[PDB]
Write an enzyme that holds these catalytic residues in place. Sequence first.
Site, PDB file in Angstrom:
ATOM      1  N   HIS A  62       1.113  -0.865   0.233  1.00  0.00           N
ATOM      2  CA  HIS A  62       0.277  -0.141  -0.254  1.00  0.00           C
ATOM      3  C   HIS A  62       0.576   1.290  -0.126  1.00  0.00           C
ATOM      4  O   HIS A  62       0.130   2.184  -0.974  1.00  0.00           O
ATOM      5  CB  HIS A  62      -0.757  -0.045   1.448  1.00  0.00           C
ATOM      6  CG  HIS A  62      -1.931  -1.351   1.337  1.00  0.00           C
ATOM      7  ND1 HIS A  62      -2.831  -1.263  -0.067  1.00  0.00           N
ATOM      8  CD2 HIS A  62      -2.204  -2.511   1.884  1.00  0.00           C
ATOM      9  CE1 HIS A  62      -3.390  -2.429   0.283  1.00  0.00           C
ATOM     10  NE2 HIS A  62      -2.509  -3.146   1.672  1.00  0.00           N
ATOM     11  N   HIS A  92       5.219   7.078   6.879  1.00  0.00           N
ATOM     12  CA  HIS A  92       4.543   6.355   5.443  1.00  0.00           C
ATOM     13  C   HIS A  92       4.590   7.295   4.802  1.00  0.00           C
ATOM     14  O   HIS A  92       3.807   8.981   5.679  1.00  0.00           O
ATOM     15  CB  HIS A  92       3.832   5.715   5.286  1.00  0.00           C
ATOM     16  CG  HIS A  92       2.582   5.297   6.161  1.00  0.00           C
ATOM     17  ND1 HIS A  92       2.528   5.401   7.651  1.00  0.00           N
ATOM     18  CD2 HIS A  92       1.276   6.268   5.349  1.00  0.00           C
ATOM     19  CE1 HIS A  92       1.382   5.630   7.120  1.00  0.00           C
ATOM     20  NE2 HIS A  92       0.614   6.617   6.414  1.00  0.00           N
ATOM     21  N   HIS A  94       1.820   8.935   1.494  1.00  0.00           N
ATOM     22  CA  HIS A  94       1.242   9.061   0.248  1.00  0.00           C
ATOM     23  C   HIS A  94       1.191   9.711  -0.623  1.00  0.00           C
ATOM     24  O   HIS A  94       1.570  10.943  -0.257  1.00  0.00           O
ATOM     25  CB  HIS A  94      -0.516   9.478   0.881  1.00  0.00           C
ATOM     26  CG  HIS A  94      -1.148   9.041   2.226  1.00  0.00           C
ATOM     27  ND1 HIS A  94      -2.235   7.247   2.089  1.00  0.00           N
ATOM     28  CD2 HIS A  94      -0.565   8.369   3.220  1.00  0.00           C
ATOM     29  CE1 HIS A  94      -1.665   6.738   3.105  1.00  0.00           C
ATOM     30  NE2 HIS A  94      -0.901   7.932   3.971  1.00  0.00           N
ATOM     31  N   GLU A 104      -3.717  12.992   0.703  1.00  0.00           N
ATOM     32  CA  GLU A 104      -5.020  13.523   1.787  1.00  0.00           C
ATOM     33  C   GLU A 104      -5.774  14.638   2.124  1.00  0.00           C
ATOM     34  O   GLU A 104      -6.063  15.164   1.795  1.00  0.00           O
ATOM     35  CB  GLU A 104      -4.419  12.335   2.733  1.00  0.00           C
ATOM     36  CG  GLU A 104      -3.686  10.542   1.751  1.00  0.00           C
ATOM     37  CD  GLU A 104      -4.250   9.648   2.768  1.00  0.00           C
ATOM     38  OE1 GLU A 104      -3.498   9.540   3.931  1.00  0.00           O
ATOM     39  OE2 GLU A 104      -4.284   8.133   2.196  1.00  0.00           O
ATOM     40  N   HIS A 117       3.176  10.848   6.865  1.00  0.00           N
ATOM     41  CA  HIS A 117       2.189  10.496   7.921  1.00  0.00           C
ATOM     42  C   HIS A 117       2.549   9.719   9.578  1.00  0.00           C
ATOM     43  O   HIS A 117       3.610   8.920   8.828  1.00  0.00           O
ATOM     44  CB  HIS A 117       1.389   9.553   7.560  1.00  0.00           C
ATOM     45  CG  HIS A 117       0.292  10.248   7.297  1.00  0.00           C
ATOM     46  ND1 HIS A 117      -0.957   9.459   6.665  1.00  0.00           N
ATOM     47  CD2 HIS A 117      -0.513  11.596   6.948  1.00  0.00           C
ATOM     48  CE1 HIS A 117      -2.114  10.557   6.003  1.00  0.00           C
ATOM     49  NE2 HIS A 117      -1.478  11.842   6.360  1.00  0.00           N
ATOM     50  N   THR A 196      -6.762   6.509   7.305  1.00  0.00           N
ATOM     51  CA  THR A 196      -7.119   6.250   5.923  1.00  0.00           C
ATOM     52  C   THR A 196      -6.408   5.369   5.380  1.00  0.00           C
ATOM     53  O   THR A 196      -6.894   6.087   4.319  1.00  0.00           O
ATOM     54  CB  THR A 196      -5.840   7.898   5.524  1.00  0.00           C
ATOM     55  OG1 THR A 196      -4.271   7.710   5.346  1.00  0.00           O
ATOM     56  CG2 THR A 196      -6.257   9.547   6.743  1.00  0.00           C
TER      57      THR A 196
HETATM   58  C1  R8Q Z   1       1.108  -2.350  12.205  1.00  0.00           C
HETATM   59  C2  R8Q Z   1       1.606  -0.968  12.298  1.00  0.00           C
HETATM   60  C3  R8Q Z   1       0.839   0.230  11.242  1.00  0.00           C
HETATM   61  S1  R8Q Z   1       0.198   1.513  11.576  1.00  0.00           S
HETATM   62  C4  R8Q Z   1      -0.315   2.440  10.238  1.00  0.00           C
HETATM   63  C5  R8Q Z   1      -0.178   2.452   8.736  1.00  0.00           C
HETATM   64  F1  R8Q Z   1       0.736   1.413   8.119  1.00  0.00           F
HETATM   65  C6  R8Q Z   1      -1.346   2.990   7.809  1.00  0.00           C
HETATM   66  F2  R8Q Z   1      -1.140   3.112   6.837  1.00  0.00           F
HETATM   67  C7  R8Q Z   1      -1.889   3.639   8.381  1.00  0.00           C
HETATM   68  S2  R8Q Z   1      -2.857   4.902   7.402  1.00  0.00           S
HETATM   69  O1  R8Q Z   1      -4.313   5.323   7.284  1.00  0.00           O
HETATM   70  O2  R8Q Z   1      -2.274   4.547   6.039  1.00  0.00           O
HETATM   71  N1  R8Q Z   1      -2.713   6.499   7.113  1.00  0.00           N
HETATM   72  C8  R8Q Z   1      -3.639   7.036   8.179  1.00  0.00           C
HETATM   73  C9  R8Q Z   1      -2.070   4.607   9.741  1.00  0.00           C
HETATM   74  F3  R8Q Z   1      -2.532   5.018  10.292  1.00  0.00           F
HETATM   75  C10 R8Q Z   1      -1.377   4.086  10.361  1.00  0.00           C
HETATM   76  F4  R8Q Z   1      -1.580   3.739  11.535  1.00  0.00           F
HETATM   77 ZN    ZN Z   2      -0.680   8.075   6.187  1.00  0.00          ZN
END
Ligand code: R8Q
Ligand code: ZN
Length: 258
Positions: A62, A92, A94, A104, A117, A196
Amino acid sequence: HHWGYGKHNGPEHWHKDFPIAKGERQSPVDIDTHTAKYDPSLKPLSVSYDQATSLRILNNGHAFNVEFDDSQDKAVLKGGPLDGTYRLIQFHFHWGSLDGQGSEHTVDKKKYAAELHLVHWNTKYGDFGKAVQQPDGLAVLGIFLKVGSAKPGLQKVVDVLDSIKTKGKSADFTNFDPRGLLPESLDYWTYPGSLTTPPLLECVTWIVLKEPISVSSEQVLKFRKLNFNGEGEPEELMVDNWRPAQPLKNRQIKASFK
Ligand SMILES: CCCSc1c(F)c(F)c(S(=O)(=O)NC)c(F)c1F
Ligand SMILES: [Zn+2]
Ligand code: NA
Ligand code: NA
């Protein structure tokens, strides 16, 4: 047929497996800077990243995640709108297929090329998996990227990407200092929202910095050479892994600044 970012399994499909996608505090949102309320009682944000311990970088299909040892209070976020201490677990990004999209959150409907993020969990709850089940479990620090001058503190990340090109690849990633990704100002907007990506859990206090960092075109081009597929599966470039803005509903975005 799992979730992802396409015509057949992208954001507009996620509500069929994750009905909270149409919930009351979903993220991201457009930040209307004129209607954001200045709150003179919001504290400065405390980012204490001096003892951070990165461990690994991972392509999860992702995005790519830079993971930290979160077994002690080493890289923590506190203050700002937060009560309590939140531990950095990973960051990470986006990003888009073109410099004109990728973020985002949006600011007065403006899209940035990418968004960083930095994910933190409330020490209250003992670990990340318990924290995501709580309405104040996570604090995500969001930082916009615009394309211009290079960010030298990003280049160690960009240079390793060719080693995690495909889904499920990882690489050792020690001694990476996330202070190199922060803009000069910690002025922020804040609101209650969600993850997200699925499971889209409504557990996030969002803290979005007003000042973007600049990265070069070459840096973001390297993000776009990653792949959503596994090795030996057909090539699908990892681009446009962003969820679009969701309805604000009954929420007020607060500003730490006028
Ligand atoms: C097992 C640890 C993975 S923590 C993780 C993540 F991998 C992620 F992608 C997003 S997101 O929804 O993509 N950006 C808000 C998050 F919020 C997270 F907290
Ligand atoms: Zn994110
Ligand atoms: Na140390
Ligand atoms: Na954990």
